[PDB]
Design an enzyme around this catalytic site. Structure first.
Site, PDB file in Angstrom:
ATOM      1  N   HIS A  10       0.800  -1.231   0.000  1.00  0.00           N
ATOM      2  CA  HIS A  10       0.000   0.000   0.000  1.00  0.00           C
ATOM      3  C   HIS A  10       0.827   1.274   0.000  1.00  0.00           C
ATOM      4  O   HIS A  10       0.333   2.363  -0.322  1.00  0.00           O
ATOM      5  CB  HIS A  10      -0.976   0.029   1.181  1.00  0.00           C
ATOM      6  N   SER A  31      -0.261  -0.830  -6.463  1.00  0.00           N
ATOM      7  CA  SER A  31       0.072  -1.921  -7.372  1.00  0.00           C
ATOM      8  C   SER A  31       0.815  -1.507  -8.629  1.00  0.00           C
ATOM      9  O   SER A  31       0.745  -0.365  -9.060  1.00  0.00           O
ATOM     10  CB  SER A  31      -1.195  -2.660  -7.805  1.00  0.00           C
ATOM     11  N   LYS A  58     -14.508  -7.618  -9.501  1.00  0.00           N
ATOM     12  CA  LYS A  58     -13.574  -8.433 -10.259  1.00  0.00           C
ATOM     13  C   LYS A  58     -13.012  -9.528  -9.327  1.00  0.00           C
ATOM     14  O   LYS A  58     -12.773 -10.656  -9.763  1.00  0.00           O
ATOM     15  CB  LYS A  58     -12.459  -7.525 -10.789  1.00  0.00           C
ATOM     16  N   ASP A  59     -12.806  -9.202  -8.047  1.00  0.00           N
ATOM     17  CA  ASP A  59     -12.286 -10.177  -7.082  1.00  0.00           C
ATOM     18  C   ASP A  59     -13.328 -11.243  -6.745  1.00  0.00           C
ATOM     19  O   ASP A  59     -12.993 -12.419  -6.593  1.00  0.00           O
ATOM     20  CB  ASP A  59     -11.821  -9.489  -5.790  1.00  0.00           C
ATOM     21  N   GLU A  79       4.330 -34.577  -3.177  1.00  0.00           N
ATOM     22  CA  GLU A  79       3.079 -33.929  -3.536  1.00  0.00           C
ATOM     23  C   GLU A  79       3.414 -33.217  -4.859  1.00  0.00           C
ATOM     24  O   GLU A  79       4.555 -32.771  -5.057  1.00  0.00           O
ATOM     25  CB  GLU A  79       2.709 -32.905  -2.445  1.00  0.00           C
TER      26      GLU A  79
HETATM   27  C1  HEM Z   1       0.341 -16.477   1.552  1.00  0.00           C
HETATM   28  C2  HEM Z   1       0.851 -15.903   0.271  1.00  0.00           C
HETATM   29  C3  HEM Z   1       0.535 -14.635  -0.284  1.00  0.00           C
HETATM   30  C4  HEM Z   1      -0.524 -13.771  -0.040  1.00  0.00           C
HETATM   31  C5  HEM Z   1      -1.802 -14.022   0.808  1.00  0.00           C
HETATM   32  C6  HEM Z   1      -0.315 -12.660  -0.932  1.00  0.00           C
HETATM   33  C7  HEM Z   1      -1.249 -11.659  -1.169  1.00  0.00           C
HETATM   34  C8  HEM Z   1      -1.087 -10.562  -2.014  1.00  0.00           C
HETATM   35  C9  HEM Z   1      -2.136  -9.616  -2.389  1.00  0.00           C
HETATM   36  C10 HEM Z   1      -3.565  -9.555  -1.845  1.00  0.00           C
HETATM   37  C11 HEM Z   1      -1.584  -8.768  -3.274  1.00  0.00           C
HETATM   38  C12 HEM Z   1      -2.233  -7.576  -3.958  1.00  0.00           C
HETATM   39  C13 HEM Z   1      -2.936  -7.849  -5.289  1.00  0.00           C
HETATM   40  C14 HEM Z   1      -2.043  -8.515  -6.335  1.00  0.00           C
HETATM   41  O1  HEM Z   1      -1.195  -7.822  -6.960  1.00  0.00           O
HETATM   42  O2  HEM Z   1      -2.190  -9.741  -6.527  1.00  0.00           O
HETATM   43  C15 HEM Z   1      -0.216  -9.170  -3.441  1.00  0.00           C
HETATM   44  C16 HEM Z   1       0.705  -8.522  -4.268  1.00  0.00           C
HETATM   45  C17 HEM Z   1       2.022  -8.875  -4.464  1.00  0.00           C
HETATM   46  N1  HEM Z   1       2.590 -10.027  -3.945  1.00  0.00           N
HETATM   47 FE1  HEM Z   1       1.749 -11.385  -2.777  1.00  0.00          FE
HETATM   48  N2  HEM Z   1       0.929 -12.729  -1.577  1.00  0.00           N
HETATM   49  C18 HEM Z   1       1.389 -13.976  -1.240  1.00  0.00           C
HETATM   50  C19 HEM Z   1       2.644 -14.477  -1.622  1.00  0.00           C
HETATM   51  C20 HEM Z   1       3.532 -13.784  -2.338  1.00  0.00           C
HETATM   52  C21 HEM Z   1       4.714 -14.417  -2.891  1.00  0.00           C
HETATM   53  C22 HEM Z   1       5.049 -15.920  -2.832  1.00  0.00           C
HETATM   54  C23 HEM Z   1       5.335 -13.424  -3.576  1.00  0.00           C
HETATM   55  C24 HEM Z   1       6.534 -13.506  -4.307  1.00  0.00           C
HETATM   56  C25 HEM Z   1       7.698 -14.369  -3.880  1.00  0.00           C
HETATM   57  C26 HEM Z   1       4.495 -12.230  -3.522  1.00  0.00           C
HETATM   58  C27 HEM Z   1       4.785 -11.038  -4.224  1.00  0.00           C
HETATM   59  C28 HEM Z   1       3.919 -10.002  -4.420  1.00  0.00           C
HETATM   60  C29 HEM Z   1       4.217  -8.809  -5.135  1.00  0.00           C
HETATM   61  C30 HEM Z   1       5.573  -8.446  -5.740  1.00  0.00           C
HETATM   62  C31 HEM Z   1       3.003  -8.080  -5.183  1.00  0.00           C
HETATM   63  C32 HEM Z   1       2.704  -6.758  -5.909  1.00  0.00           C
HETATM   64  C33 HEM Z   1       2.126  -7.137  -7.273  1.00  0.00           C
HETATM   65  C34 HEM Z   1       1.940  -5.959  -8.223  1.00  0.00           C
HETATM   66  O3  HEM Z   1       1.472  -4.885  -7.791  1.00  0.00           O
HETATM   67  O4  HEM Z   1       2.248  -6.124  -9.423  1.00  0.00           O
HETATM   68  N3  HEM Z   1       3.346 -12.479  -2.827  1.00  0.00           N
HETATM   69  N4  HEM Z   1       0.080 -10.310  -2.716  1.00  0.00           N
HETATM   70  C1  LIG Z   2       9.682 -28.672  11.564  1.00  0.00           C
HETATM   71  C2  LIG Z   2       9.551 -28.252  10.154  1.00  0.00           C
HETATM   72  C3  LIG Z   2      10.380 -28.584   9.133  1.00  0.00           C
HETATM   73  C4  LIG Z   2      11.588 -29.457   9.290  1.00  0.00           C
HETATM   74  C5  LIG Z   2      10.074 -28.057   7.805  1.00  0.00           C
HETATM   75  C6  LIG Z   2      10.924 -27.903   6.782  1.00  0.00           C
HETATM   76  C7  LIG Z   2      10.454 -27.705   5.444  1.00  0.00           C
HETATM   77  C8  LIG Z   2      11.266 -27.562   4.391  1.00  0.00           C
HETATM   78  C9  LIG Z   2      10.868 -27.054   3.026  1.00  0.00           C
HETATM   79  O1  LIG Z   2       9.841 -26.019   3.072  1.00  0.00           O
HETATM   80  C10 LIG Z   2      10.365 -24.701   3.340  1.00  0.00           C
HETATM   81  C11 LIG Z   2      10.356 -28.203   2.083  1.00  0.00           C
HETATM   82  C12 LIG Z   2       8.882 -28.582   2.377  1.00  0.00           C
HETATM   83  C13 LIG Z   2      10.510 -27.779   0.596  1.00  0.00           C
HETATM   84  O2  LIG Z   2      11.915 -27.501   0.333  1.00  0.00           O
HETATM   85  C14 LIG Z   2      12.209 -26.158  -0.079  1.00  0.00           C
HETATM   86  C15 LIG Z   2      10.005 -28.865  -0.397  1.00  0.00           C
HETATM   87  C16 LIG Z   2      10.010 -28.281  -1.819  1.00  0.00           C
HETATM   88  C17 LIG Z   2      10.800 -30.190  -0.298  1.00  0.00           C
HETATM   89  C18 LIG Z   2      10.429 -31.074  -1.458  1.00  0.00           C
HETATM   90  C19 LIG Z   2      10.701 -32.544  -1.362  1.00  0.00           C
HETATM   91  O3  LIG Z   2       9.543 -33.183  -0.907  1.00  0.00           O
HETATM   92  C20 LIG Z   2       9.536 -34.565  -0.776  1.00  0.00           C
HETATM   93  C21 LIG Z   2       8.310 -35.106  -0.315  1.00  0.00           C
HETATM   94  O4  LIG Z   2       7.228 -34.328  -0.002  1.00  0.00           O
HETATM   95  C22 LIG Z   2       8.196 -36.533  -0.175  1.00  0.00           C
HETATM   96  O5  LIG Z   2       6.971 -36.992   0.277  1.00  0.00           O
HETATM   97  C23 LIG Z   2       6.612 -38.350   0.001  1.00  0.00           C
HETATM   98  C24 LIG Z   2       9.303 -37.368  -0.503  1.00  0.00           C
HETATM   99  C25 LIG Z   2      10.530 -36.802  -0.961  1.00  0.00           C
HETATM  100  O6  LIG Z   2      11.641 -37.549  -1.323  1.00  0.00           O
HETATM  101  C26 LIG Z   2      11.565 -38.969  -1.257  1.00  0.00           C
HETATM  102  C27 LIG Z   2      10.676 -35.370  -1.098  1.00  0.00           C
HETATM  103  C28 LIG Z   2      11.934 -34.712  -1.568  1.00  0.00           C
HETATM  104  O7  LIG Z   2      12.972 -35.338  -1.862  1.00  0.00           O
HETATM  105  C29 LIG Z   2      11.866 -33.219  -1.676  1.00  0.00           C
HETATM  106  C30 LIG Z   2      13.089 -32.504  -2.151  1.00  0.00           C
END
Ligand code: HEM
Ligand SMILES: C/C=C(C)/C=C/C=C/[C@H](OC)[C@@H](C)[C@@H](OC)[C@@H](C)CCc1oc2c(O)c(OC)cc(OC)c2c(=O)c1C
Ligand SMILES: CCCCCCCC/C=C\CCCCCCCC(=O)OC[C@H](COP(=O)(O)OCCN)OC(=O)CCCCCCC/C=C\CCCCCCCC
Ligand code: HEM
Ligand SMILES: CCCCCCO[C@@H]1O[C@H](CO)[C@@H](O)[C@H](O)[C@H]1O
Lengths: 99, 48, 263, 370, 62, 74
Positions: D192, D196, D218-219, D262
């Protein structure tokens, strides 16, 4: 090729289809924001309208009639002189900052 | 393995029928509101 | 040629009214009229007789953004009934309730109009005025206000709030104040030969007759809270308005918001 | 109650031209609220004791009124959450939204937190994938030199995934979504401040429209389509995106032969599996996600959005096609020719992001003479 | 001297907010009953003879 | 960021119609389809090639995998 490829790229980029000039598309960092602030009124007002028109077209997912597309040969940098100076002033201030 | 099998499909039918109604309706509502922007016209009149 | 064409086509005796007010007798005026206006043409071809067609009203908005101007001007109106319509009296009473206002008024915070009162205490505008512009079969019923660029939204909000309040809850006491203002406006206006003369000229053209103050009083007397609620609802409630804005109007509400504010 | 409810929503200035790709933010919010509501109702019947966990889930699905619908909504909700997440991130990369540094970095943390949350939730039913997933993923920490093993056993609360692990995973899974909600609110507060971005990447201050009614409506429409996609899965194909192996209780003496993650973890899994070195695989896995934090630093273009950058678009779509390739490879056995396709696809992923895209940005600047 | 259907619906049910609200309410009740019965009928027809309600008579009298 | 303090705009006129005065689906199909076709044609060279490549690698790889598991007489 370059100029041949340049005009091709210019049209492929397509901001000209929205009636924009290349400088209208520059990412606005602080140097750019200051350059814009320094633009003479007419250039500033023109930029504003071309952006408003482009945003409006984008919203409708439309483009201008081809005869109104900005032409590669006519697109010139209205921002360059202002921005170059803004950047030179900042570089000067940084030199002094290093004492 | 899936005693809810028949129930979920009956609900699925109702869900499709409801979305079949609600989606075009909400979509018409969206177009209704946005029509004000979609048909707006712009004119630039700088003094010159 | 364009001008002579225009004149020959519209300046016809049947489209004119010779009016007079003051120390003179009708017979004398008639005498003078017979002597000087008899030669005036009373005809103009078969396809000459200019006739007014109805003019469609369109809910819409025109915004001329000019941030270089110090104050924003906004005018908003719904389609009015037209000169000849009886509803105009109750509408004038309603407009009198909302009233007018400008920064030099002495009432300030104590003004009876909620809009004027709010405007004054919160410094929401320099001035505002309601209006009922009438034409043959249509018109513009609404208001105009001048304010700072950061107050447009607030002004619109309170203005529309007041229109809705009248549609749904005009009270007898405020309608009585409206009637009294309208009574005073009518009489104080017809003060002098010029205002009376114009009222004669214009009334003959529009109503086709001079409407006497005794008749205006009867029409006003007939107006009560119920009538104000019903007549205001008929012209304002959930109707599309026409909106015009000029100046630093970035804060002028979007048309959809304005339209929603009508109900 | 006025302001912050207001000037914060209704009169929020929004670009007049944001497309459907801007709907995913609100959809993520809705996925979060759906997960939280269904999750809470499931928590009302789930028990985390390894002797009753699997049984409590079957009881929810079989005897709790509408338990099956709440359970499958939660499961498929997680998948919808990820579909939206990836679209959301994709939108940000294509349009240069990552230049909103704070918003983008909090976004990266959100992504990692949702992945951790989904992972833990998946362990709760205590089926075969739950158990082995818990074993493998926590063991990623064992790649840490000298203390990795200590960390793992500490997390497990023992020398192996057991009772202690399941009980703490239920408590972590329970609280993390709420932490995610708070972080998402910060994600929004940072947004904000700037407002955007939009498809053209050009400042939209000259053409803002109120959030309401334009984007509120739209949402709502976007939300309805999200619900449609979700319920089609829940009511017509509830196991489509799931793994049959999790319908088999955990067996610590046996890891299914075709075990696989997954679907939303398949690409990262493909990457880790591509490296015949333990530490190497774990570092590449971590980097496949953390590289998002580097995107802002790799931006070479004088323009923000890819809308006006044909070369960048080609590379962007190659990247999307590559993730699709990695997702497909992750679902295949470690055998020829998949091993080589996965290695190539893993190299391409990093190559596109670290070299090709920045290079394209510079080439386009040259073509435009600046 | 005749209003169209929608113009009639507007004046009676949609103009006032209280009436508009009561139209949606009764609307919802009449809609629910008819929608549910119609939808179920379609379902039971598509699955004629397969549901418990369809073969139930063969075992009842208990 | 709020309306009234966004930015400076001068000499721009905007004209709009109430939604109740206009059709919500003007030329939905007559102009809609053509636009969708223009937009589709405008991006396909950018979007499609990578997915066709994926499609090729996928069919090649899958088939290569199947072949490798059968008849190896020796
Ligand atoms: C629990 C996950 C997330 C929630 C609830 C969330 C929610 C939101 C909402 C409501 C907006 C405003 C509307 C829109 O542009 O879509 C937004 C914008 C944005 N989000 Fe997220 N977000 C999430 C995850 C992330 C992730 C994974 C990234 C990137 C690694 C991210 C990057 C951004 C950026 C850069 C904007 C601005 C977009 C623009 O104005 O072009 N968000 N997010
Ligand atoms: C106490 C909490 C703890 C320790 C949490 C830590 C979480 C770490 C990460 O999240 C941030 C992690 C979920 C994320 O890594 C970036 C995923 C992409 C990892 C992907 C992932 O999944 C597998 C999986 O699901 C399986 O299921 C049957 C079996 C698997 O191989 C046999 C895998 C596997 O080889 C990998 C790389
Ligand atoms: C993560 C692992 C998951 C596996 C990946 C599987 C992905 C499968 C592909 C689904 C993507 C749908 C593609 C449809 C888009 C087609 C299209 O219209 O493209 C052209 C179109 C042209 O738009 P403009 O340049 O703004 O010009 C407007 C002129 N009127 O471009 C766009 O729509 C760009 C928006 C794309 C953003 C979303 C991309 C999908 C995201 C996928 C993965 C994201 C990457 C990051 C993940 C790493 C963790
Ligand atoms: C970002 C939020 C969340 C995500 C992504 C998520 C994801 C998941 C996943 C992937 C599963 C496995 C489902 C299955 O296949 O059976 C799961 C299970 C579960 N989750 Fe969540 N969850 C979320 C929030 C919550 C919350 C807030 C609670 C509790 C207050 C909750 C309670 C549960 C419970 C009890 C289960 C076990 C029952 C089941 O397996 O369906 N979840 N969750
Ligand atoms: C929307 C289209 C989804 C792609 C359908 C395949 O989906 C996959 O099916 C496998 C079993 O066949 C599962 O083990 C896997 O988890 C699932 O993602």
């Amino acid at each position: 090729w370059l100029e041949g490829i340049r005009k091709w790229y210019y049209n492929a980029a397509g901001f000209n289809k929205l009636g924009l000039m290349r400088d209208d598309t520059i990412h606005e960092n602080d140097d750019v924001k200051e350059a814009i602030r320094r633009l003479p009124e007419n250039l500033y007002d023109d930029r504003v309208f071309r952006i408003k028109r482009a945003l409006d077209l984008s919203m409708r997912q439309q483009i201008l009639p081809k005869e109104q597309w900005t032409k590669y040969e006519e697109d010139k940098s209205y921002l360059e002189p202002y921005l170059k100076e803004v950047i030179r002033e900042r570089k000067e201030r940084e030199e002094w900052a290093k004492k | 393995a899936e005693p809810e099998h028949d129930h979920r499909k009956r609900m699925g039918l109702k869900m499709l029928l409801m979305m079949g109604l609600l989606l075009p309706l909400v979509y018409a509502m969206k177009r209704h509101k946005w029509s004000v922007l979609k048909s707006r016209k712009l004119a630039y009149r700088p003094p010159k | 040629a364009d001008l002579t064409e225009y004149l020959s086509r519209h300046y016809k005796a049947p489209r004119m009214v010779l009016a007079a007010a003051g120390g003179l007798e009708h017979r004398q005026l008639l005498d003078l009229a017979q002597k000087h206006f008899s030669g005036l043409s009373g005809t103009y071809d078969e396809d000459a007789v200019p006739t007014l067609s109805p003019c469609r009203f369109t809910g819409s908005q025109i915004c001329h953004r000019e941030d270089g101007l110090p104050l924003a001007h906004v005018a908003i109106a719904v389609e009015g009934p037209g000169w000849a319509h009886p509803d105009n009296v109750a509408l004038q009473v309603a407009n009198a309730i909302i009233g007018h206002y400008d920064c030099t008024y002495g009432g300030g915070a104590h003004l009876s109009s909620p809009l004027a009162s709010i405007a004054a205490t919160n410094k929401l505008c320099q001035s505002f005025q309601t209006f009922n512009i009438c034409y043959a079969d249509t018109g513009l019923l609404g208001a105009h206000f001048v304010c700072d660029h950061m107050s447009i939204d607030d002004m619109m909000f309170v203005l529309q709030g007041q229109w809705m309040r009248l549609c749904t809850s005009a009270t007898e006491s405020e309608v009585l104040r409206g009637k009294n203002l309208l009574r005073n406006a009518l009489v104080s206006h017809l003060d002098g030969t010029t205002p009376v003369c114009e009222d004669i000229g214009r009334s003959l053209l529009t109503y086709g007759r001079r409407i006497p103050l005794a008749e205006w009083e009867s029409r006003i007397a007939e107006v009560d809270a119920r009538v104000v609620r019903e007549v205001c609802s008929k012209y304002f409630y959930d109707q599309c308005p026409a909106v015009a804005g000029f100046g630093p109007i970035e804060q002028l509400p979007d048309y959809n918001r304005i339209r929603s504010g009508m109900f | 109650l006025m302001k912050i409810v207001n000037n914060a929503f209704i009169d929020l200035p929004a670009p007049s031209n944001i497309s459907s790709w801007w709907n995913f933010g609100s959809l993520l919010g809705i996925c979060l609220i759906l997960q939280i509501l269904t999750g809470l109702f499931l928590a009302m019947h789930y028990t985390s004791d390894t002797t009753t966990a699997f049984s409590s889930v079957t009881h929810i699905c079989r005897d709790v009124n509408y338990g099956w619908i709440i359970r499958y909504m939660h499961a498929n909700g997680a998948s919808m959450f990820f579909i939206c997440l990836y679209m959301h991130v994709g939108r940000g990369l294509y349009y240069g939204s990552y230049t909103f540094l704070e918003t983008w970095n909090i976004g990266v943390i959100l992504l990692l937190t949702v992945m951790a949350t989904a992972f833990m939730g998946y362990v709760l039913p205590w089926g075969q994938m739950s158990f082995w997933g818990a074993t493998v993923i926590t063991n990623l920490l064992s790649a840490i030199p000298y203390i990795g093993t200590n960390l793992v056993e500490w997390i497990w609360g023992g020398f192996s995934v057991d009772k202690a692990t399941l009980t703490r995973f239920f408590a972590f899974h329970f609280i993390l979504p709420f932490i995610i909600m708070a972080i998402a609110m910060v994600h929004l507060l940072f947004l904000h401040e700037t407002g955007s971005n939009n498809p053209t990447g050009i400042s939209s201050d000259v053409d803002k429209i109120p959030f309401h009614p334009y984007y509120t409506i739209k949402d709502i429409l976007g939300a309805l389509l999200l619900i449609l996609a979700l319920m089609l899965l829940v009511l017509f194909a509830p196991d489509l995106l799931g793994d049959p192996d999790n319908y088999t209780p955990a067996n610590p003496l046996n890891t299914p032969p075709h075990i696989k993650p997954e679907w939303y973890f398949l690409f990262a899994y493909a990457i880790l599996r591509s490296i015949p070195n333990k530490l190497g695989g774990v570092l590449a896995l971590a980097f496949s996600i953390l590289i998002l934090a580097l995107i802002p630093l790799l931006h070479t273009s004088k323009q923000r959005s890819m809308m006006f950058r044909p070369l960048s678009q080609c590379l962007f779509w190659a990247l999307v096609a590559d993730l699709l390739t990695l997702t497909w490879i992750g679902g295949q056995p470690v055998e020829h020719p998949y091993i080589t396709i996965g290695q190539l696809a893993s190299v391409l992923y990093f190559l596109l992001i670290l070299v090709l895209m920045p290079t394209a940005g510079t080439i386009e600047n040259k073509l435009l003479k600046w | 001297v005749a209003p169209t259907l929608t113009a009639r619906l507007y004046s009676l049910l949609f103009r006032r907010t209280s009436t508009f609200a009561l139209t949606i309410v009764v609307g919802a009740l009449f809609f629910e009953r008819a929608f549910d019965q119609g939808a179920d009928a379609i379902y039971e027809h598509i699955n004629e003879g397969k549901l418990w309600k369809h073969i139930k008579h063969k075992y009842e009298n208990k | 960021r709020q309306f009234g303090h966004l930015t400076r705009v001068r000499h721009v006129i905007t004209y709009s119609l109430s939604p109740f005065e206009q059709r919500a689906f003007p030329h939905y199909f007559s102009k809609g389809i053509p636009n969708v076709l223009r937009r589709t044609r405008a991006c396909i060279l950018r979007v499609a090639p990578p997915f066709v490549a994926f499609y090729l690698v996928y069919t090649w790889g899958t088939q290569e995998f199947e072949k490798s598991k059968r008849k190896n007489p020796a």
